[PDB]
Amino acid sequence: DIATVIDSHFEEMTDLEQEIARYFLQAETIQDDLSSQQVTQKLHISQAALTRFAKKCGFTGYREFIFQYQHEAENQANQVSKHSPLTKRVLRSYSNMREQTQDLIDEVQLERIAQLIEDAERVYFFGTGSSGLVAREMKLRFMRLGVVCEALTDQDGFAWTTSIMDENCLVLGFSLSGSTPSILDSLLDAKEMGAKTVLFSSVPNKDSQAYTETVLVATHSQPSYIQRISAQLPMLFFIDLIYAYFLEINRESKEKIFNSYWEN
Amino acid sequence: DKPDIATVIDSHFEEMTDLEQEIARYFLQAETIQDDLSSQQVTQKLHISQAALTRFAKKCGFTGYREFIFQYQHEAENQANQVSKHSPLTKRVLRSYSNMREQTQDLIDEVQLERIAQLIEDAERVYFFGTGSSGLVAREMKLRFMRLGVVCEALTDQDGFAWTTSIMDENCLVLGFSLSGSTPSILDSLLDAKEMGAKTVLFSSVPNKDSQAYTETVLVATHSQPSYIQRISAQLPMLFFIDLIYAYFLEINRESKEKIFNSYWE
Amino acid sequence: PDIATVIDSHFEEMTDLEQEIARYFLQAETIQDDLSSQQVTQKLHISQAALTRFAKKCGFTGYREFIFQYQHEAENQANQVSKHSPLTKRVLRSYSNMREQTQDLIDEVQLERIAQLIEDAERVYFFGTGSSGLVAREMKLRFMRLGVVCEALTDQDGFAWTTSIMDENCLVLGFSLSGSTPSILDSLLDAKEMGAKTVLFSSVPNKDSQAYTETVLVATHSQPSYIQRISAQLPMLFFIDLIYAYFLEINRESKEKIFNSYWEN
Amino acid sequence: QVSKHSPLTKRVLRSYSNMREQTQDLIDEVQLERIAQLIEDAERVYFFGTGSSGLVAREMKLRFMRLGVVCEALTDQDGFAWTTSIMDENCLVLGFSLSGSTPSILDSLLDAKEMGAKTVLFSSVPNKDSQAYTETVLVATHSQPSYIQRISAQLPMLFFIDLIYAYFLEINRESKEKIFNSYW
Ligand SMILES: [Cl-]
Ligand SMILES: [Cl-]
Ligand SMILES: [Cl-]
Ligand SMILES: [Cl-]
């Protein structure tokens, strides 16, 4: 804007004043003390040359010119981005995952699952690797609301625990790939025991209907394995959604339980 | 009584050049809506320039193709897709995620994160200290960085912090996670690592004033929900900065780090 | 004198059967045989009493004394003097002095009661920190395979969160080798107010332990100094294995199906 | 009604005593002092175990950490792969497999050897690939035949861990004792 007006009058300007236009056409200029004193000392010109340049540009003088020079830069810059390409690949990978999950939500299903946890006597969260930390996280959150739950992160524990579940148990299995055999095959063992089974996967079903519920979670935005964000995060979206539905079932009794940590 | 987008194209057809007319004929077909009508796929279908398409949109009275193609598709819209079908609880959880992204954006100090990435690279052995939800964060970071060749350990108890600080040396880096910013064990332990020569980084959502000592103090996002019970996963504030640091740290000597990461599959 | 000259010096006092045996033992090749006492009898087709009579003719209190001497002479190995270093003997001693002290502390009725409590509970919990956390995990691994619904906890957050959800169908077992781990003692008390039964395993009696349902006294370590003691799990592994053995005999058949279901496909 | 002690108490304690008897017979004193030295020589020491052997690995991590050894215990095979990819010539790995055929541990130790790391296998069965690792330690076999009636599966390894601990403690004892007491 102010750069275009400069170019339109650039010719009418003397070589020295043309130099002053050149300096202010630089982006680096703003990162500098732009008082008339410093500009004159810096470019080794007189005040009069500065005033003549500013009026060449249609302003009454340097003060009006520089007053806009600041505002302009503040009216932009806040419009531009101040984030590195890496900080932005990270921020967009999260935003992309929040967008995609919002498309994936089956809200009736999540309230169905919140009620299943409520009606279960014992609940178990199966996962390995990063999805085993997700399973750990669920146990702490739902324990504070009074759920009897346990987190298991290895194959011995899976088989060991499946053998002692019954129709009053609920097992939530987390397999981002939708392939992790340890988890998938152990959810099938629990069904044979009569327990209800919910599978979380970022990968569509392939006869996944064998489980009580299959929750489709978001795939990652980054195609390369190394460049992705936490493998936990797709699962955390829906844990926090399920948590929010579950908390509202008998919320009054659950807050008593949640608070009795503090109560001596 | 509203002007259908089709009636509009014809109202301007006779103001159009011949090429614009060819574009109009394509867009006047009812079966054209069942196409990918991005500007990049329409140009190739019609073998025209993006500038030629913009001119067509402007002949029809729009500010550009994006405006034109929205109305071309909004009139075909079969439902009130705009309205939020969500329930207040879903939208409470989602705002909590989005708001934390925003507060993270405003808190990032990119020079510090690269520095912390460099601290991890320059250290030979690095330890992550955390309890409860933050111990899960510490364990997650271990999975992230050990697959890039870093010598790291995740600790999740006061006894471990003590046993590890007693053997810490100057070539150690300890990252401590205390969302409240006042966890006595995490803070006491990081001073134990300081006295043993190791560098210390604290992650906290509250600007800790008495702890100007640690090599670095990183301000993390606070949760948007006032009540603890309704908050989202307490890991996520820290996960934001782990992913950022990881992104910074991966670009430092990437070839060897990708080689270690891919060696699993090897 | 050798053992063959004594066998021969009594040969003429011997019965015909005893001389047949003397003939077996006078052979040089016979010491490359299993000379147990039940093996020699089978081979010679004789009775133990007949072998004892043989030994007695040779001047021994019985066969076991005779065969020992017969095997001492041939042997040059010092199967008597220990080959171990002082450090090895000290560790083995500590492990054995713990078998001994454990044995001196066993209260068989108490351990039977404790097994029954585990059976009567619907949910069981094991609380322990450090090395006592590993014991808690092991107990969980052994008892879940007998069908018990149990959980192992290793930090204060876990104890507090789980105690607040405990009810009268709960049984919590706390491991504090020192007997004064504040988190274990307090968590056990919190579990009591929720109505659960409580068992403390400790090597130090403390007045405050009378508050819990049971106090189990475990072995103190032989080594005075912390750094030289053998381990920290060992005193409790002793009693876990004893309680387990008791607990398996309660409805064994059921817990043998659950145990073997793991192997089953 | 059940003698001085009962049949069950005698069985449990006779399993412990027999473990001590078998352990004493099998000890290879020079081997144990060799492993003690190796642990000192390594810059990083790792302990691999599954199930009950995993608890043994966690204890060894606990004990040798208080003496100054930089150690890490691993229970999940995914972690076995992640650590194997970063091990070098100055790493020592102790794998615990009571059966001697738990795949994860065997392949992990092979992988560690490929990276140039010292490897030690604990096993109640003499592994056929005995020379494969720098050392192959023989541990006690359980007295009871039936799996369900056996005493703790940990114990065979706890014996040799304390033996190695007692030897390794004497190497540079004074400095390790200072590290131990820095806790208080
Ligand atoms: Cl991503
Ligand atoms: Cl929140
Ligand atoms: Cl001892
Ligand atoms: Cl046994």
Coordinates of N, CA and C in Angstrom, one line a residue, chain C residues 82-96 223 225 227-230, chain D residues 23-24 27 29-30 32-34 36-37 159-173:
Chain C
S82 N 35.1 -77.1 52.2 CA 34.3 -76.2 51.2 C 35.3 -75.6 50.2
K83 N 34.8 -75.5 49.0 CA 35.6 -74.8 48.0 C 35.3 -73.4 47.8
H84 N 34.3 -72.8 48.6 CA 33.8 -71.5 48.4 C 34.6 -70.4 49.0
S85 N 34.5 -69.2 48.5 CA 35.1 -68.0 49.1 C 34.3 -67.6 50.3
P86 N 34.9 -66.8 51.2 CA 34.1 -66.2 52.3 C 32.8 -65.5 51.8
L87 N 32.9 -64.7 50.7 CA 31.8 -64.0 50.2 C 30.6 -64.9 49.8
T88 N 31.0 -66.0 49.1 CA 29.9 -67.0 48.7 C 29.3 -67.7 49.9
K89 N 30.1 -68.0 50.9 CA 29.6 -68.6 52.1 C 28.7 -67.6 52.8
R90 N 29.0 -66.4 52.8 CA 28.2 -65.4 53.5 C 26.8 -65.2 52.9
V91 N 26.8 -65.2 51.5 CA 25.5 -65.1 50.8 C 24.6 -66.3 51.1
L92 N 25.2 -67.5 50.9 CA 24.5 -68.7 51.1 C 24.0 -68.8 52.6
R93 N 24.8 -68.4 53.5 CA 24.4 -68.4 54.9 C 23.2 -67.5 55.1
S94 N 23.3 -66.2 54.6 CA 22.2 -65.3 54.7 C 20.9 -65.9 54.1
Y95 N 21.0 -66.6 53.0 CA 19.8 -67.2 52.4 C 19.3 -68.4 53.3
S96 N 20.2 -69.1 54.0 CA 19.8 -70.2 54.8 C 19.3 -69.7 56.2
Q223 N 22.4 -59.9 57.6 CA 23.5 -58.9 57.5 C 23.1 -57.6 58.2
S225 N 24.3 -54.5 58.0 CA 24.4 -53.3 57.1 C 23.5 -53.4 55.9
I227 N 23.8 -52.3 52.9 CA 24.4 -52.5 51.6 C 24.8 -54.0 51.5
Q228 N 25.0 -54.8 52.5 CA 25.5 -56.1 52.4 C 24.3 -57.2 52.5
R229 N 23.1 -56.8 52.9 CA 22.0 -57.7 53.0 C 21.8 -58.4 51.6
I230 N 21.3 -59.6 51.7 CA 21.2 -60.4 50.4 C 20.3 -59.6 49.4
Chain D
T23 N 21.8 -74.6 44.0 CA 22.5 -73.4 43.7 C 24.0 -73.5 44.2
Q24 N 24.2 -74.0 45.4 CA 25.6 -74.1 45.9 C 26.4 -75.0 45.0
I27 N 27.4 -73.3 41.5 CA 28.2 -72.0 41.5 C 29.5 -72.2 40.8
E29 N 32.6 -69.9 40.8 CA 33.0 -68.7 41.5 C 33.7 -67.8 40.6
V30 N 34.7 -68.3 39.7 CA 35.4 -67.4 38.8 C 34.5 -66.7 37.8
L32 N 31.3 -65.9 38.4 CA 30.6 -64.8 39.0 C 31.5 -63.6 39.2
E33 N 32.8 -63.8 39.6 CA 33.7 -62.7 39.7 C 33.9 -62.0 38.3
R34 N 33.8 -62.8 37.3 CA 34.0 -62.3 35.9 C 32.8 -61.4 35.6
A36 N 30.9 -59.9 37.7 CA 31.0 -58.7 38.5 C 31.9 -57.7 37.8
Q37 N 33.1 -58.2 37.3 CA 34.0 -57.3 36.7 C 33.4 -56.7 35.4
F159 N 19.3 -65.9 43.8 CA 20.5 -66.4 44.3 C 21.8 -65.9 43.6
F160 N 21.9 -66.1 42.3 CA 23.1 -65.6 41.6 C 23.2 -64.1 41.5
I161 N 22.1 -63.4 41.6 CA 22.2 -61.9 41.6 C 22.9 -61.4 42.8
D162 N 22.5 -62.0 44.0 CA 23.1 -61.6 45.2 C 24.6 -62.1 45.3
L163 N 24.9 -63.2 44.7 CA 26.3 -63.6 44.6 C 27.1 -62.6 43.8
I164 N 26.6 -62.3 42.6 CA 27.3 -61.3 41.8 C 27.3 -59.9 42.5
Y165 N 26.2 -59.6 43.2 CA 26.2 -58.4 43.9 C 27.3 -58.3 45.0
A166 N 27.4 -59.5 45.7 CA 28.4 -59.5 46.8 C 29.8 -59.4 46.2
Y167 N 30.1 -60.0 45.1 CA 31.4 -59.9 44.5 C 31.6 -58.5 43.9
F168 N 30.6 -58.0 43.1 CA 30.8 -56.7 42.5 C 30.8 -55.6 43.5
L169 N 30.2 -55.8 44.7 CA 30.3 -54.7 45.7 C 31.8 -54.5 46.1
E170 N 32.6 -55.6 46.2 CA 33.9 -55.5 46.7 C 34.9 -54.8 45.7
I171 N 34.5 -54.8 44.4 CA 35.3 -54.0 43.5 C 35.1 -52.5 43.7
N172 N 36.1 -51.8 44.2 CA 36.1 -50.4 44.5 C 35.0 -50.1 45.5
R173 N 35.0 -50.9 46.6 CA 33.9 -50.8 47.6 C 33.7 -49.4 48.1

